[PDB]
UniProtKB/Swiss-Prot annotation:
Taxonomic lineage from the root: Eukaryota, Fungi, Dikarya, Ascomycota, Saccharomycotina
Miscellaneous remark of the record: Present with 468 molecules/cell in log phase SD medium.
Gene name tied to this protein: PRP8
Subunit structure: Component of the U4/U6-U5 tri-snRNP complex composed of the U4, U6 and U5 snRNAs and at least PRP3, PRP4, PRP6, PRP8, PRP18, PRP31, PRP38, SNU13, SNU23, SNU66, SNU114, SPP381, SMB1, SMD1, SMD2, SMD3, SMX2, SMX3, LSM2, LSM3, LSM4, LSM5, LSM6, LSM7, LSM8, BRR2 and DIB1.
Function: Functions as a scaffold that mediates the ordered assembly of spliceosomal proteins and snRNAs. Required for association of BRR2 with the spliceosomal U5 snRNP, and the subsequent assembly of the U4/U6-U5 tri-snRNP complex. Functions as a scaffold that positions spliceosomal U2, U5 and U6 snRNAs at splice sites on pre-mRNA substrates, so that splicing can occur. Interacts with both the 5' and the 3' splice site, as well as the branch region. Has a role in branch site-3' splice site selection. Associates with the branch site-3' splice 3'-exon region. Also has a role in cell cycle.
Positions spanned in the full protein: 806 to 858 of 2413
Subcellular location: Nucleus
Protein name, entry field: Pre-mRNA-splicing factor 8
Comment text on domains: The MPN (JAB/Mov34) domain has structural similarity with deubiquitinating enzymes, but lacks the residues that would bind the catalytic metal ion.
Amino acid sequence: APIKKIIERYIKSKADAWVSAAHYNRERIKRGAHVEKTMVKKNLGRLTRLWIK
RNA sequence: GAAUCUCUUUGCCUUUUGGCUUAGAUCAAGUGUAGUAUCUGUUCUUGUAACAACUGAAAUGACCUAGGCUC
């Protein structure tokens, strides 16, 4: 239980950090604000995944 | 009773793994794109006799203190 719980919490944290980041990236893309091609691709992928979820 | 050895079970053991990213990407393409670099064979290359002169070289080793004669 405890170890598992801790792991869960950290993955939640990661998600929070990740999802927010993705959102930010998307916003940037929408604007037209020096997005990296690779970064944009990642955002597209990540965002797609999020949508699916 | 004490010493030791052999086997079995439990505990202990890699009853199996040292990262992240768009599962990293793709199982497709008359490709495009940028750069970096030089080659084929065919040929040139006097004799005879007489007189004057020498009779012989080289190798390493035997003597003496690189040099000097002998074998």
